Design a protein around this ligand. Structure first.
Ligand SMILES: NS(=O)(=O)c1cccc2c1c([N+](=O)[O-])cc1[nH]c(=O)c(=O)[nH]c12
Lengths: 342, 297, 50, 50
């Protein structure tokens, strides 16, 4: 009638929800996901637990980071790649001028010499004169620094990228400020956090109390939306059972991570002085041991669900193959043009 | 007062021995073969573009180009210099990419586990797994409804030889001795304690399979069994059970700072390229001999 | 000749691997050596067993 | 005069680098086998060339 789980008011002992209907006795028994407490055990008689639960972590699922088709030109910025081309022209033109003056270095050959130096593939002909040698030496000094800077920067890029750890355990949460974490406004979760006498979960709640925006969310479903909106900047703590179901049903952008923190179990309740305790309690044990619950839990979660080597990849280099093919395409066209001419 | 289940334990992954062709690790096996095919294409195109450069002479040029050594073979045609220069840029990126990725391997080393889940060792079917001869977990395996453990009981029953030990102490001993060849299945509680104890060479993997628990037993009738049941539930809420389990399991243990030091490279890991060298040398003698032998006749 | 070329090609393949392995290993040697901190504060003592 | 509890460790000695501390990346048995291979390569090349 009420729609609540079960709670008594502090003034009048008026029990609302599922347990309230049981106390005076409108119904015989109840089968609902309801946790066991010392407070609840007095007024209503709880049976043996059937499904165990715990508090776990929910973050935004790391999306499949498809590497850029040109993600091999990342080390050097775009304005550098521009100035290498400009310099390459200016070097050849100057070389061409000072080489032949009233020489093998023609307009075609001087252009071929400059590329051979940068690519590091030796040379056919060396500059003979003093004027040609001095411009050749500086272009050699330019090449050696640009190449070695590119190799070292790419070495640094891959070194950092592989030594990163995702937020795995509750200890990782305890030592992080960039990724925020908050619970519901009121419940059994926050109440546990206040009188928590643990290792570094006392420090966890110490941070939770003082935040810039309000970390505590009123609604649970709206709290799941806040994790989506942040996109790897907020984590929402809740029960494990609810967390696993949220990954399966609805658009996939969430997942469970780490082990369970708290210990709590659901149960089946009927008011004390009931003769129904006998056969029901043993039936629960009959279902669990044979494996009725475990098959049934597999069905509604997974079966009725709508979700589901660290070398250098091909995709990272893929781009440079397109340059190779396009070059050979032009090569065939040049052969086509000068055959019709002659 | 605490929950538990049946879990998997394996020997620590440690570090492998690099045998031969271990130097091809930085790049994928897909890329290597693409370079082989591509260099044939460039060589063939160079010949067709030209019509000195033949089939034999063109192949040598593009091999000498990839190794980054200067010969005396230079395409004199405009069309060929478009081919040559483009093939050069390919060479420059592949070499530089190799060097970078190899540096990352020797800076930080990652030892990753071969198996992840119960469904993982259901497909792998390589490493042996069993339980005690007769126990609670053995009886669970026999009577199973779902297909995954039914397939597992098929393996456990028709095992050559039988993967069953007398004691749980014998099971742990068999895991460490086998060295990634036997995986023991028991309670998650004991498994976590054995990992923390000396000298630390085993760890827990995956989730639990079933869900069971321990409790406080009292004779039939139970005139004094009512209040102590309620008290434990309150001490569960306060967090005394978690405090006490943290004291004996984790606090009192053998292994708790990770300090890594870069070691010098041994001959075993470079050995691969040495066999290739001497093998190629012996082949060169063979071809030179028969080239002279049939030229004589 | 063909006999002289094949022995040259393997010696080229040998060279390129030995050189690149030497550079990468020295890169790893200096990277590790500079990212080390001495026991400064009491917090550093708290998280050390050696 | 004010006092406090502090830490006392063994002073890090002046780590004078080895005069040949640039051949550390590769072990001694590798440097040996590069020389042996170098001779074997030359002799074989010499034979099949002429
Ligand atoms: N929907 S919820 O986000 O997960 C959730 C949020 C908050 C309190 C819950 C609760 C669930 N539950 O799993 O449905 C069951 C449950 N049972 C109790 O007995 C109790 O006191 N509080 C709860």
């Amino acid at each position: 009638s009420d729609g609540k789980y079960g709670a008594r008011d502090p003034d009048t002992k008026a029990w609302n929800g599922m347990v309230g209907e049981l106390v005076y006795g409108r119904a015989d028994v109840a089968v609902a996901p309801l946790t066991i407490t010392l407070v609840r055990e007095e007024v209503i008689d709880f049976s043996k637990p059937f499904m165990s639960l715990g508090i776990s972590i929910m973050i935004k699922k790391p999306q499949k980071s498809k590497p850029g088709v040109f993600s091999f030109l990342d080390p050097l910025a775009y304005e550098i790649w521009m100035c290498i081309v400009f310099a390459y022209i200016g070097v050849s033109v100057v070389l061409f001028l000072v080489s032949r003056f009233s020489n093998e270095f023609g307009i075609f050959n001087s252009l071929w010499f400059s590329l051979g130096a940068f690519m590091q593939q030796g040379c056919d002909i060396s500059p003979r004169s003093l004027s040609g040698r001095i411009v050749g030496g500086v272009w050699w000094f330019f090449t050696l620094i640009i190449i070695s800077s590119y190799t070292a920067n790419l070495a640094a890029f891959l070194t950092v990228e592989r030594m990163v750890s995702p937020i795995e355990s509750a200890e990782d949460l305890a030592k992080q400020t960039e990724i925020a974490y908050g619970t519901l406004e009121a419940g059994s979760t926050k109440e546990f956090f206040r009188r928590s006498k643990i290792a570094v979960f006392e420090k966890m709640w110490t941070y939770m109390k003082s935040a810039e925006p309000s970390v505590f969310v009123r609604t649970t479903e709206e709290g799941m939306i806040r994790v989506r909106k942040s996109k790897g900047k907020y984590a929402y703590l809740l029960e494990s059972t609810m967390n696993e179901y949220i990954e399966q049903r609805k658009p996939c952008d969430t997942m469970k991570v780490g082990g369970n923190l708290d210990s709590k179990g659901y149960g089946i309740a009927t008011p004390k002085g009931s003769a129904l305790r006998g056969p029901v309690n043993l039936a629960v044990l009959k279902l669990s041991e044979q494996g009725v619950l475990d098959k049934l839990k597999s069905k509604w979660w997974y079966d009725k669900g709508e979700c589901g080597t660290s070398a250098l990849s091909l995709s990272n280099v893929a781009g440079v193959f397109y340059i190779l093919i396009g070059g050979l395409g032009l090569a065939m066209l040049v052969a086509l043009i000068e055959f019709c001419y002659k | 007062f605490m929950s538990l289940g049946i879990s998997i334990m394996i020997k620590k992954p440690q570090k492998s021995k690099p045998g031969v062709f271990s130097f091809l690790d930085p790049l994928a096996y897909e890329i290597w073969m693409c370079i082989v095919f591509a260099y044939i294409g460039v060589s063939v195109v160079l010949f067709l573009v030209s019509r000195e450069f033949g089939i034999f002479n063109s192949l040598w040029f593009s091999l000498g180009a990839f190794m980054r050594q200067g010969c005396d073979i230079s395409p004199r045609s405009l069309s060929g210099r478009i081919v040559g220069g483009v093939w050069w840029f390919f060479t420059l990126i592949i070499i530089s990419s190799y060097t970078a990725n190899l540096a990352a391997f020797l800076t930080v080393e990652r030892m990753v586990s071969p198996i992840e889940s119960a469904e993982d060792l259901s497909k792998q079917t390589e490493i042996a797994y069993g339980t005690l001869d007769s126990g609670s977990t053995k009886e669970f395996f026999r009577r199973s409804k779902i297909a995954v453990f039914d397939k597992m009981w098929t393996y456990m029953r028709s095992a050559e030889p039988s993967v069953f030990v007398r004691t749980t102490a014998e099971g742990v001993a068999r895991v460490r001795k086998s060295k990634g060849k036997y995986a023991y299945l028991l309670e998650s509680t004991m498994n976590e304690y054995i990992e923390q104890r000396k000298p630390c060479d085993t760890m827990k993997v995956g989730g639990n399979l079933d869900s069971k628990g321990y409790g406080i037993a009292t004779p039939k009738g139970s005139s004094l069994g009512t209040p102590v049941n309620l008290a434990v539930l309150k001490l569960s809420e306060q967090g005394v059970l978690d405090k006490l389990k943290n004291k004996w399991w984790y606090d009192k243990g053998e292994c708790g700072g990770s300090k890594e030091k870069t070691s010098a490279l041994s001959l075993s890991n470079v050995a691969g390229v040495f066999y290739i060298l001497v093998g190629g040398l012996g082949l060169a003698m063979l071809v030179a001999l028969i080239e002279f032998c049939y030229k004589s006749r």
